[PDB]
Amino acid sequence: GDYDYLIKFLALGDSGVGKTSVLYQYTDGKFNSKFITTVGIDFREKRVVYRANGPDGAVGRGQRIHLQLWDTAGLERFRSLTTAFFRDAMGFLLLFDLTNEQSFLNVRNWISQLQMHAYSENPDIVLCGNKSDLEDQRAVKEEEARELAEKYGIPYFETSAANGTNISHAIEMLLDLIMKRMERS
Amino acid sequence: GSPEFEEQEAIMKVLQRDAALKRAEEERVRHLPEKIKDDQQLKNMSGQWFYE
Ligand SMILES: Nc1nc2c(ncn2[C@@H]2O[C@H](COP(=O)(O)OP(=O)(O)NP(=O)(O)O)[C@@H](O)[C@H]2O)c(=O)[nH]1
Ligand SMILES: [Mg+2]
């Protein structure tokens, strides 16, 4: 129990977009190429130190955060289970697959579900366009995704769970948003 | 077991792990008054702020 705050996030998006891979890359720095679809729900954890104003020196300033990162299944057979878990999450990592246009077109529907079921009508969400390493299979234009993200006022990162690009960025952003919300309130 | 049953078994194991984390967290929060007695910091650290 050597930490200061338990912060809970949830990853959501269509089946196959990379929710499990993104989280595993973040917490363990590892990646599995074989598709092992999530059985309803799972979570991962990571201990980090939040420093809002950058590095400290001799006097420790950081807030020790225990992250619980909920990992939801995308298949509709688990939709009621996964929706049940939206209300207890402090922030959301919403994913689509850069190689799958339909997963991107479904982003609006996922946002609508969060607005209904989350703790707030306007919860903190970071949008992740995943599988950026697969440029030859790319089907979603960066500008289109940015436009969408802009309309909702949400940050957009293009990520790769394969090599880790922008994963820590996206999650640290989400952490910053909720810690500032805590400061606000 | 059937796939139906195996699926519930797997999810139950996740829920059990979550329960253990929740109990650990609750025990941490219980001990906070030993070190921090400013109730606003307690509200923040305990996660009570998230429920207002
Ligand atoms: N090249 C590449 N492959 C990725 C990336 N992210 C995930 N994958 C691959 O895509 C497949 C699906 O990943 P997974 O994380 O299981 O997706 P999911 O969103 O958790 N699926 P579900 O909701 O069904 O559990 C796997 O074969 C995985 O290796 C990525 O950034 N790059
Ligand atoms: Mg998964």
8-state DSSP, A62: P
Q: Label residues A161-173 b or e (16+ Cβ within 10 Å = b).
A: bbebbbbebbbeb
Say whether B9 sits in a helix, a strand or coil: helix
Between CA A1 and CA B48 the distance in angstroms is 18
Between CA A87 and CA A114 the distance in angstroms is 8
Of A119, A113, A84, A94, nearest to A17 by C-alpha is A94
Give percent helix, percent strand, percent coil of chain B, each to the nearest 5.
Answer: 85, 0, 15
- Torsion of Cα atoms, A72 then B15 then A7 then A174, to 10°: 0
Say whether B33 sits in a helix, a strand or coil: helix
Question: What is Dmax (Cα atoms) for chain A?
Answer: 52
Between CA B19 and CA A109 the distance in angstroms is 31
Which domain, by its residues, includes B21? 1-52
Of A90, A85, A53, nearest to A72 by C-alpha is A85
Residue in A with minimal Cα distance to B7:
A39
Of A76, A100, A98, nearest to A12 by C-alpha is A76
**Domain spanning A1-185 has what CATH number?**
3.40.50.300
Cα A44 → chain centroid: 12
Of A180, A181, A174, nearest to A8 by C-alpha is A174
Between CA A131 and CA A180 the distance in angstroms is 29
Atom number of ligand 1 nearest to Cα A32: 29
Place of tokens 């910091």: B41
First to last CA, chain A: 25
Of A91, A96, A93, A95, nearest to A118 by C-alpha is A91
Shortest alpha-carbon distance between residue A4 and chain B (Å): 6
Q: Is the CB of A83 under 6 A from ligand 1?
A: no
Between CA A16 and CA A184 the distance in angstroms is 36
Q: Which amino acid would we find at residue B9?
A: E
Q: Residue A175 is inside which H or E element, if any? A: helix A167-184
* Tally of domains in chain B: 1
With vertex at residue A44, the alpha carbon angle to CA B31 and CA B16, rounded to the nearest 5 degrees, is 65
Q: Residue A156 is inside which H or E element, if any? A: strand A156-158
Say whether A76 sits in a helix, a strand or coil: helix
A145: tokens are 């995704």
- The residue ranges of every structural domain in chain A are 1-185
CB A102: neighbour CB atoms within 10 A?
Answer: 11
Of A92, A160, A76, nearest to A124 by C-alpha is A92
CATH number, domain of B2, equals 6.10.250.3000
This structure's resolution (Å) is: 1.8
CB contact under 8 A, B44 and A5: yes
- Contact indicator for A47, A63 with CB cutoff of 8 Å: no
* Torsion angles phi and psi, residue A73, rounded to 5: -80, 145
Between CA A171 and CA A116 the distance in angstroms is 23
A31: tokens are 């990646």
Residue in A with minimal Cα distance to B41:
A4
Angle between helix axes A107-117 and A142-152 (nearest 10 degrees) is 20
Burial bucket for residue A93 (CB in 10 Å: 0-12, 13-18, 19+): buried
Atom number of ligand 1 nearest to Cα A17: 19
Nearest CA to ligand 1 atom 26: A35
